Amino acid sequence: ATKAVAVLKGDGPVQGTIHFEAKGDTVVVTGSITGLTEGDHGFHVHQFGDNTQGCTSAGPHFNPLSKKHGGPKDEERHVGDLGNVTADKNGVAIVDIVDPLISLSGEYSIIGRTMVVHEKPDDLGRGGNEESTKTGNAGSRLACGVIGIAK
């Protein structure tokens, strides 16, 4: 696809709309999240677009290359690692990212997979424990939604 959208909902107060657009070899992600705790939050594309068990059935981070977790700027990261989204003190996160590893077509396409906003900030694989290397210690998945094709 050329454009996609994810509608995030959870069993909690967090919610939001994420838009994605193909611009060359990169993906531009925009949109907002409200209902969040002030500060930073991991934001990642989880591999399955399965909402049968809420956010739990979306599986792990999408990593077709079997790499360790990292930040959006690391060579060593999961295809779905988009770091953190920051909320202001009213709980609003303004997502603005341009990322060259995710894709709306081909092998690394994220269409049909899950976008998840996490309970805690992402450590970016730099925390010193096993759990940092697979999820960034981001804890709990607050809201998620299957990425689908859009206008």
- Could you give the count of Cα atoms lying within 13 Å of 62 in the half-sphere of its Cβ? 25
Residues in the interface with its own copies (CB under 8 A) total: 15
Q: Does 122 bind Zn ion (CB under 5 A)?
A: no
Q: How far is 63 from 45, CA to CA, in rounded Å?
A: 9
Residue 137 structure tokens: 């210690």
Contact yes or no for 80/63 (Cβ under 8 A): yes
Could you give the residue numbers annotated as active site?
Answer: 44, 46, 61, 69, 78, 81, 118, 141
Which of 6/35 has CB closer to Zn ion?
6
Task: Name the one range near its own copies by CB under 8 A: 45-53, 61-69, 91-99, 128-136.
Answer: 45-53
Query: Quick one: which of 46, 61, 118, 141 contacts Zn ion (CB under 5 A)?
Result: 61
Query: Quick one: which of 10, 20, 47, 78 contacts Zn ion (CB under 5 A)?
Result: 78
CA–CA distances in Å: residue 134 to residues 8, 106, 114: 22, 24, 17
Task: Name the one range near its own copies by CB under 8 A: 30-38, 50-58, 61-69, 83-91.
Answer: 50-58
Nearest one of 124, 43, 55 to 80, comparing CA atoms: 43
Residue 136 structure tokens: 């960034």
Task: Name the one range near Zn ion by CB under 5 A: 51-59, 73-81, 102-110, 142-150.
Answer: 73-81
Q: How far is 58 from 48, CA to CA, in rounded Å?
A: 4
Q: How far is the CB of 81 from Zn ion (least distance, A)?
A: 4
Q: Does 141 bind Zn ion (CB under 5 A)?
A: no
